[PDB]
Design a protein around this ligand. Structure first.
Ligand SMILES: *[C@@H]1O[C@H](CO)[C@@H](O)[C@H](O)[C@H]1NC(C)=O
Ligand SMILES: *[C@@H]1O[C@H](CO)[C@@H](O)[C@H](O)[C@H]1NC(C)=O
Ligand SMILES: *[C@@H]1O[C@H](CO)[C@@H](O)[C@H](O)[C@H]1NC(C)=O
Ligand SMILES: *[C@@H]1O[C@H](CO)[C@@H](O)[C@H](O)[C@H]1NC(C)=O
Lengths: 216, 75, 48, 226, 49
């Protein structure tokens, strides 16, 4: 998980909504509700900041070339789907589809929408598949995907010839593993539970809050 | 001079179709700035410069020159 | 209470406001009239 | 060239830190926050919480103990609640400060006292080194990194066919300027003649997809012919 | 959530933008690469090892 729901609770309306006498009695407490408003605004700006720090890490917007020759490696399952209104991948679409008031509490929309986050992810993916690690340390320098895989293999101490002799087999295993990831992510939604519960907790919190409006 | 966005109602800022880097964040991808005669403008924030790579299976971009840079990290 | 700039000034209790966005108040539509609805009671009760 | 670039970059950093005040904001705000919190606490001494007066000397000099105790009870409830909120905020801020201090300590350990292979952990680019500097309630790391500046596009091949065997580069990559094939290190263009001490033999040319046919110079041949 | 976001940012910076040498930092095995994917209020990392 990266961010929470940017909730903002109006102090004066929550405690003394549409009541002048209650607000006059609350004024005898000084700056409590103002300081909790400051705290929640700080929470919201911290959520926006962590989102920006997580996703806005590249200076340029990278795209894959019209050629899809990656040495047998199929990336159409994690590359953007040009036919969707939201430029997200198929697996990202499955993920988004597999995840589930008037008393002064509102929810502010995030600064970075889902489409911009998907475009960030697509740019980073194109960069890492077509330039290795050069686009992070500097400019995106084109490298054939087979040679990038050879570099990744040399990075762990296995010679590039071991990759070349089993290049087709490695590509087939990678494609089968991507298909298995698709099947596992589409079959069960518990894998992303570490996120859903969070929302639930927040929701539950809000619930408790409004429930405390019924106490005497 | 009224603009309706998913963040709410913005009065006083002129809506510009051109995208720029976010200066004052408003929300839902909308950001505000002060630009030209000068006035407050609202715009969809840019995500960076568009740069495609000249990828192929027999081409390498190799650096012929380098630079030594220094960055400041405050903590 | 003169204008949004002065509102921000007294919410930030400063004569100088830096560049950025600042939440200053809460707008709420006020009701224009009152609507009372009661049963068409037809019988005064023998309290006397 | 490296020395001149480093000195000019240090001068630019000096100019930026002496001309940009907001570059210290990420520290100053912290102090401000604390100050703000303190101010709020002080302001909470002005609240009545329902009592007839905020100053205790007025309450004790006006009310008999049976009712001065009620007013003081209201006042102490309010003040203890405000102080509890204050100390909770201070504890959370101190936990955040401890997390940031642990991060800074790990950075100092793995970046200044040694060399970090973690990308973007010691600044943007290929990390070379870092220098520490003190700051009021803070630390400033000057991270020295290596960044490619100018680049060129060459024609490459995953292997080279010489005598029927597949030759692969021991270090670097095979490139072609259009007329000649060379081997050069990946992080810098330096074309070198394809020799037996730069490449190694493994397999044959019938396994590598995209292998080009060329020649590999053997330094032993001219020594043995004479 | 801020701690988790810092962890995710470090993992994306060192595993996607580079090649981390820590075992079990980029999944079980010897890390080869990583792919980031968006998700509602989260990030899914495909670690290829
Ligand atoms: C990848 O797989 C898809 C279907 O799973 C197929 O349509 C496509 O031709 C394959 N190859 C690519 C995208 O290069
Ligand atoms: C990749 O290699 C194949 C195999 O010879 C070749 O036909 C093709 O032109 C090369 N380039 C691209 C962009 O596919
Ligand atoms: C590399 O670029 C720097 C930029 O200042 C320049 O001074 C230097 O002469 C260049 N060196 C080469 C070999 O191009
Ligand atoms: C040299 O390499 C080329 C490349 O395919 C191949 O066709 C040829 O048979 C090889 N041997 C020669 C030219 O003797």
């Amino acid at each position: 998980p990266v961010s929470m729901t940017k909730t903002s609770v109006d102090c004066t309306m929550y405690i003394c909504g549409d009541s002048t006498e209650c607000s006059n009695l609350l004024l005898q407490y000084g700056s409590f509700c103002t300081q909790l408003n400051r705290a929640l605004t700080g929470i919201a700006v911290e959520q926006d900041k962590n989102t920006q720090e997580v996703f806005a890490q590249v200076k340029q917007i990278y795209k894959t070339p019209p050629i899809k020759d990656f040495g047998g490696f199929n990336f159409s399952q994690i590359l953007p789907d040009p036919s969707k209104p939201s430029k997200r991948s198929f697996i990202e679409d499955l993920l988004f589809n597999k995840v589930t008031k008037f008393n002064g509490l509102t929810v502010l929309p995030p600064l970075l929408t889902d489409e911009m986050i998907a475009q960030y992810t697509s740019a980073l993916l194109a960069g890492t598949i077509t330039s290795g690690w050069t686009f992070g340390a500097g400019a995106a320098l084109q490298i054939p995907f087979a040679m990038q895989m050879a570099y990744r293999f040399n990075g762990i101490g296995v010679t590039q010839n071991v990759l070349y002799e089993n290049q087709k087999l490695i590509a087939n295993q990678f494609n089968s593993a991507i298909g298995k990831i698709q099947d596992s992510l589409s079959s069960t939604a518990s894998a992303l539970g570490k996120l859903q519960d969070v929302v639930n907790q927040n929701a539950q919190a809000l619930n408790t809050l409004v429930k405390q409006l019924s106490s005497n | 001079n009224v603009f309706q966005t998913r963040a709410g109602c913005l009065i006083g800022a002129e809506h510009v179709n051109n995208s720029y880097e976010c200066d004052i964040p408003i929300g839902a991808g909308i950001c505000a700035s002060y630009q030209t005669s000068q006035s407050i403008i609202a715009y969809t924030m840019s995500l960076g410069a568009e740069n495609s790579v000249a990828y192929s299976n027999n081409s390498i971009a190799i650096p012929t020159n380098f630079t030594i840079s220094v960055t400041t990290e405050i903590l | 209470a003169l204008d949004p700039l002065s509102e921000t000034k007294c919410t930030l209790k400063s004569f100088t406001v830096e560049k950025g966005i600042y939440q200053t108040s809460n707008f709420r539509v006020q009701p224009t009239e009152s609507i009372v609805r009661f049963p068409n009671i037809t019988n005064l009760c023998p309290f006397g | 060239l490296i020395a001149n670039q480093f000195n000019s970059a240090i001068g630019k950093i000096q100019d930026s830190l002496s001309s940009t005040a907001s570059a210290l904001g990420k520290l100053q705000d912290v102090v401000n926050q604390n100050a703000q919190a303190l101010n709020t606490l002080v302001k909470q001494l002005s609240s009545n919480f329902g009592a007839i007066s905020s100053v205790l000397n007025d309450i004790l000099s006006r009310l008999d103990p049976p009712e001065a105790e009620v007013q003081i009870d209201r006042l102490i409830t309010g003040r203890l609640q405000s102080l509890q909120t204050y100390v909770t905020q201070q504890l959370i801020r101190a936990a955040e400060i401890r997390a940031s201090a642990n991060l800074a300590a790990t950075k100092m350990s793995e970046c200044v006292l040694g060399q970090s292979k973690r990308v973007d952990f010691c600044g943007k680019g290929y990390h070379l080194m870092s220098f520490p500097q003190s700051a009021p309630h803070g630390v400033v790391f000057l991270h020295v990194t290596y960044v490619p500046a100018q680049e060129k596009n060459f024609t490459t091949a995953p292997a080279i066919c010489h005598d029927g065997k597949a030759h692969f580069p021991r270090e670097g990559v095979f490139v072609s300027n259009g007329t000649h094939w060379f081997v050069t290190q990946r992080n810098f263009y330096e074309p070198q003649i394809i020799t037996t001490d730069n490449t190694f033999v493994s397999g044959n040319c019938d396994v590598v997809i995209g292998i080009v046919n060329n020649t590999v110079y053997d330094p032993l041949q001219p020594e043995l012919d004479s």
